[PDB]
Amino acid sequence: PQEVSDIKKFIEICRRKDASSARIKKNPKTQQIKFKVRCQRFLYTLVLKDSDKAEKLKQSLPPNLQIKDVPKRNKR
Amino acid sequence: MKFLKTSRVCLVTRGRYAGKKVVIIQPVDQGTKSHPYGHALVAGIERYPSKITRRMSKARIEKRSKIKPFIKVINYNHLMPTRYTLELEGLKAVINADTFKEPSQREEAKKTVKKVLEDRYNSGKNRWFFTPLRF
Amino acid sequence: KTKVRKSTTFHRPKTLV
Amino acid sequence: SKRTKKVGISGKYGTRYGASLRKLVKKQEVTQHARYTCTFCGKNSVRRTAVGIWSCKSCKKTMAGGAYTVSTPAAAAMRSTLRRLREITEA
Amino acid sequence: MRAKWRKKRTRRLKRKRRKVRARS
Amino acid sequence: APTRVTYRRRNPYNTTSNRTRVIKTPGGQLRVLHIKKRGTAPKCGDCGIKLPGIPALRPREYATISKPKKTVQRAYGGSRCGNCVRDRIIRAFLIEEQKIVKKVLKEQSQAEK
Amino acid sequence: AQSIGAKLALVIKSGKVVLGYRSTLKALRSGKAKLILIAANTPPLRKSELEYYSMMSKTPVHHYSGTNIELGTACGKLFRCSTMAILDAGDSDILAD
Amino acid sequence: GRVIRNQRKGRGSVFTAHTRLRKAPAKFRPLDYAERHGYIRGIVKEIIHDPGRGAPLARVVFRSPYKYKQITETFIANEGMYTGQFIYAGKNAALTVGNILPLSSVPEGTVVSNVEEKPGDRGALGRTSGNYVTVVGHNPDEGKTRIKLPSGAKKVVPSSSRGMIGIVAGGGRTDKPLLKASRAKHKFAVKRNRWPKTRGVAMNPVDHPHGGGNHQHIGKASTISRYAAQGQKAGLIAARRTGLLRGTQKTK
RNA sequence: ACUCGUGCCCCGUGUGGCGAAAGGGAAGCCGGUUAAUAUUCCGGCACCUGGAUGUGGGUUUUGCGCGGCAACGCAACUGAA
Ligand SMILES: [K+]
Ligand SMILES: [K+]
Ligand SMILES: [K+]
Ligand SMILES: [K+]
Ligand SMILES: [K+]
Ligand SMILES: [K+]
Ligand SMILES: [K+]
Ligand SMILES: [K+]
Ligand SMILES: [K+]
Ligand SMILES: [K+]
Ligand SMILES: [K+]
Ligand SMILES: [Mg+2]
Ligand SMILES: [Mg+2]
Ligand SMILES: [Mg+2]
Ligand SMILES: [Mg+2]
Ligand SMILES: [Mg+2]
Ligand SMILES: [Mg+2]
Ligand SMILES: [Mg+2]
Ligand SMILES: [Mg+2]
Ligand SMILES: [Mg+2]
Ligand SMILES: [Zn+2]
Ligand SMILES: [Zn+2]
Numbered sequence: 001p002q003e004v005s006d007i008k009k010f011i012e013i014c015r016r017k018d019a020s021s022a023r024i025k026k027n028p029k030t031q032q033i034k035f036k037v038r039c040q041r042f043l044y045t046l047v048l049k050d051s052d053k054a055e056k057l058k059q060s061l062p063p064n065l066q067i068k069d070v071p072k073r074n075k076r
Numbered sequence: 077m078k079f080l081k082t083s084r085v086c087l088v089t090r091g092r093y094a095g096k097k098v099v100i101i102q103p104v105d106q107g108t109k110s111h112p113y114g115h116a117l118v119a120g121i122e123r124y125p126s127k128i129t130r131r132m133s134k135a136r137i138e139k140r141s142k143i144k145p146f147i148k149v150i151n152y153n154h155l156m157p158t159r160y161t162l163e164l165e166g167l168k169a170v171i172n173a174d175t176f177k178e179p180s181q182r183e184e185a186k187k188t189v190k191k192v193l194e195d196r197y198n199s200g201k202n203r204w205f206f207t208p209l210r211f
Numbered sequence: 212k213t214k215v216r217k218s219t220t221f222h223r224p225k226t227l228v
Numbered sequence: 229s230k231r232t233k234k235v236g237i238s239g240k241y242g243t244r245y246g247a248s249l250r251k252l253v254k255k256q257e258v259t260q261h262a263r264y265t266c267t268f269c270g271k272n273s274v275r276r277t278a279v280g281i282w283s284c285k286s287c288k289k290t291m292a293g294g295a296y297t298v299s300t301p302a303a304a305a306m307r308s309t310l311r312r313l314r315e316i317t318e319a
Numbered sequence: 320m321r322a323k324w325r326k327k328r329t330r331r332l333k334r335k336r337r338k339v340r341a342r343s
Numbered sequence: 344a345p346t347r348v349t350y351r352r353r354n355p356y357n358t359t360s361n362r363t364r365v366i367k368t369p370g371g372q373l374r375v376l377h378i379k380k381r382g383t384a385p386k387c388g389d390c391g392i393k394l395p396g397i398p399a400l401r402p403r404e405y406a407t408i409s410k411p412k413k414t415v416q417r418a419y420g421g422s423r424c425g426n427c428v429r430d431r432i433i434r435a436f437l438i439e440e441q442k443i444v445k446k447v448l449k450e451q452s453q454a455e456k
Numbered sequence: 457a458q459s460i461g462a463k464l465a466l467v468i469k470s471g472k473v474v475l476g477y478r479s480t481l482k483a484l485r486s487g488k489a490k491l492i493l494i495a496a497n498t499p500p501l502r503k504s505e506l507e508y509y510s511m512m513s514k515t516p517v518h519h520y521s522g523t524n525i526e527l528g529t530a531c532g533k534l535f536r537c538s539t540m541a542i543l544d545a546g547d548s549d550i551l552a553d
Numbered sequence: 554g555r556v557i558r559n560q561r562k563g564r565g566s567v568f569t570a571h572t573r574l575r576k577a578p579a580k581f582r583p584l585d586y587a588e589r590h591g592y593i594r595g596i597v598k599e600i601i602h603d604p605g606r607g608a609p610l611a612r613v614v615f616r617s618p619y620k621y622k623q624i625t626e627t628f629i630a631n632e633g634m635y636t637g638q639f640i641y642a643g644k645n646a647a648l649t650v651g652n653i654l655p656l657s658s659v660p661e662g663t664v665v666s667n668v669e670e671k672p673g674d675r676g677a678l679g680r681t682s683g684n685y686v687t688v689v690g691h692n693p694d695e696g697k698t699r700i701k702l703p704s705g706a707k708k709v710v711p712s713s714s715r716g717m718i719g720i721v722a723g724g725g726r727t728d729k730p731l732l733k734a735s736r737a738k739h740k741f742a743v744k745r746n747r748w749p750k751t752r753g754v755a756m757n758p759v760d761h762p763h764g765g766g767n768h769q770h771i772g773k774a775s776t777i778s779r780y781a782a783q784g785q786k787a788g789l790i791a792a793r794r795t796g797l798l799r800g801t802q803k804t805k
Numbered sequence: 806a807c808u809c810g811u812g813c814c815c816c817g818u819g820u821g822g823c824g825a826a827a828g829g830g831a832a833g834c835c836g837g838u839u840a841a842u843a844u845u846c847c848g849g850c851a852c853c854u855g856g857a858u859g860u861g862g863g864u865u866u867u868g869c870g871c872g873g874c875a876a877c878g879c880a881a882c883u884g885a886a
Contacts, residue, residue, distance in 0.1 A: 077513055079487075091877090094432065148874090150874060153875090159440075179871095187867085211434075218818095220818065245733075249730055278609065279602070279609075279726060280602075280609045281609050290635065294632070294722075295726040296724065296728075310648065310664075310718070369836080396878085409880080411881080425875095433501065
């Protein structure tokens with residue numbers, strides 16, 4: 001797994017043919033939002049502190065991608 | 077007396093250009109603010125001309141006889157002086173310690189060094205300067 | 212009159228197969 | 229603080245092998261464990277590596293010598309005789 | 320580098336040259 | 344907490360290839376991990392010291408890392424240390440110069456007749 | 457030869473000298489050296505390098521007959537020395553011969 | 554009875570020589586054109602120790618006159634040689650320690666080592682620590698040289714044989730006592746299976762000629778004829794005399 | 806290279822196999838699961854070797870990269886016998 005620094009590169013990663021899916025994980029105790037995209041070789045993570053760009057970023061993603069919300073206590 | 081004049085031929089001893097032979101353009105026997113030691117400003121050869129034979133064609137002769145120059149400032153402790161000299165009027169004030177602060181100025185200086193060194197080599201003088209050292 | 216030989220070792224010649 | 233009267237380096241052998249044999253081995257142990265001044269660099273760092281090999285810790289040179297001394301009297305005499313034989317006849 | 324490594328690179332060049340001929 | 348461990352492979356003997364170290368797992372257990380041997384630094388070809396600027400790996404691992412990471416930008420980049428390269432350049436020049444003076448002196452001062 | 461030990465001690469007392477290899481080379485570069493001494497057991501590559509610089513700057517060179525150990529003692533020091541330069545001769549005539 | 558101990562050693566099963574740790578044998582170069590008409594030089598690269606031997610060895614690198622490569626040799630080291638030293642070999646080499654030249658190019662009284670018995674066999678005589686041979690005289694009309702050997706004997710050798718100036722390094726190794734059984738054991742453990750050694754007079758008659766008896770004794774003369782049978786030669790073979798040597802030894 | 810195997814051209818001092826589940830040696834970790842297997846099954850997250858190959862970037866207008874006094878650095882940055 002690898003980390004992505006800025007937002008512009010993370011958007012360009014999600015516009016790739018081998019991008020299978022994406023998900024959103026939020027940690028309320030430490031007030032973080034994590035965006036993860038599943039590619040052929042690696043899983044890319046982007047970490048955000050605020051919450052006024054998360055929905056802005058969410059609508060900027062390509063519409064054909066599948067985005068989930070990572071429920072607590074995922075079933076086996 | 078003094079032998080580190082402005083026409084002396086020396087050999088570089090350390091660095092990426094170790095083993096090449098250079099001609100001194102301007103000696104600086106007292107250290108400046110940067111480089112507080114004895115140093116010099118030189119121009120040299122990085123890729124020597126290739127071997128040539130009486131059986132080749134004119135087109136192949138001219139393609140093999142070309143030089144790649146370079147410029148540098150070096151400590152005196154990283155030089156080895158020789159007994160040869162190369163006094164060329166084309167290299168008088170090509171580098172003056174401020175061309176090393178602008179990349180555009182470096183390219184212009186090296187463009188001039190190539191033109192002058194090339195004509196002297198074709199004339200047929202200072203063959204020891206244009207011959208690489210085997211070590 | 213004989214051919215020149217640049218080595219002192221004799222090798223078996225090559226023939227059709 | 230002298231801590232030994234006469235046995236010296238051969239005090240590791242206790243009361244074994246006989247007095248005369250301990251003396252004879254003491255003569256050879258002292259000279260093979262000492263330091264010698266290098267002939268090439270000048271420093272006082274030359275020790276025995278193997279039974280006939282002596283090496284300098286500073287300038288990294290090794291030399292062929294005696295079993296327990298850096299040079300032998302027979303070799304030293306021969307070098308002078310060879311030097312004289314060649315020189316005073318050919319020069 | 321090893322000889323098998325170098326053989327692969329020249330093999331690709333030969334295929335590309337015959338294919339670019341086939342293209343032309 | 345003071346739990347004992349076992350090997351994870353069929354070799355039960357403590358050889359120079361049965362190297363292990365202890366870990367603790369996100370499942371709260373003490374286990375064993377099997378590890379390789381340490382790399383060795385390349386040496387200079389004249390004096391035999393460790394070359395600076397080059398990693399220490401097992402021999403097969405050098406086939407994958409890029410070229411600029413395996414060499415330094417100088418004549419005899421690998422395998423010579425730089426002090427030795429300085430000696431070679433000076434020695435080559437001085438011996439070549441004495442060759443010319445010995446030739447000229449021998450030809451002129453002794454074959455003038 | 458025999459009198460070098462006498463002449464050398466006088467230059468130490470009156471004139472000025474520089475000891476060592478790095479400083480001797482710097483003196484030759486400046487062109488203010490008048491006489492250098494080279495010990496017997498100095499490495500032959502270093503010995504040839506010193507002599508080539510002297511040819512360039514035209515200063516005489518004298519080959520001392522002792523090791524680096526006794527070239528230092530001849531200068532009154534307590535450490536070894538393999539080469540040296542003389543910047544000025546004082547009340548001595550070591551430059552005459 | 555049964556086969557005695559010194560007969561079993563010729564079979565060679567547990568009595569062979571240990572050779573894992575030895576790298577090469579010590580020989581001159583093969584005699585060639587350069588050494589017959591001029592000289593060539595090589596560089597000493599290392600001085601090494603090989604087990605089972607005194608007398609350290611030297612690794613020397615030469616250059617090929619006919620091919621673009623270099624060749625590494627293994628000589629025996631003379632006292633005074635060092636790493637980084639040039640040595641010379643041939644007819645026109647100089648009279649310096651470590652050089653190799655034919656005996657016809659040396660004056661009388663010089664000392665050499667690793668002397669060939671015949672020109673080209675690469676060295677047979679005087680190759681042990683602290684030993685040498687001495688040149689005695691010449692005979693130019695027929696081409697022979699007289700030499701003296703470490704045993705004290707005299708020999709005549711063709712003048713084209715080669716030798717190395719100096720004495721073999723290794724000094725006076727045999728001067729200090731071994732002083733311990735373990736020290737002798739370590740010495741032979743890298744040579745051959747010959748240690749320890751049981752006395753024949755302490756075996757049974759089936760084992761050795763000195764046999765048994767109600768006291769330990771030999772029972773007959775211990776000097777054995779030269780022309781005896783294998784299994785009988787146990788003791789002093791073809792002994793000219795016996796007893797403590799009082800005076801000087803007339804033979805030379 | 807073959808029209809298509811057939812035909813050409815170089816180098817040559819040397820030229821077999823078996824023999825180690827403790828010697829040398831390319832590459833995998835965590836969680837879960839069965840009555841009985843798991844570093845092998847399920848989930849997640851990686852790596853190595855071999856083979857084909859296209860985009861992005863790099864170099865070259867006078868042909869095969871720049872920087873540092875230096876030790877050396879940088880994502881690349883021709884190289885047969
Ligand atoms: K590096
Ligand atoms: K029998
Ligand atoms: K033999
Ligand atoms: K035994
Ligand atoms: K016994
Ligand atoms: K008794
Ligand atoms: K008895
Ligand atoms: K194995
Ligand atoms: K099952
Ligand atoms: K491109
Ligand atoms: K670049
Ligand atoms: Mg062996
Ligand atoms: Mg009994
Ligand atoms: Mg019997
Ligand atoms: Mg009998
Ligand atoms: Mg009996
Ligand atoms: Mg097998
Ligand atoms: Mg194994
Ligand atoms: Mg692959
Ligand atoms: Mg190359
Ligand atoms: Zn030393
Ligand atoms: Zn080195």
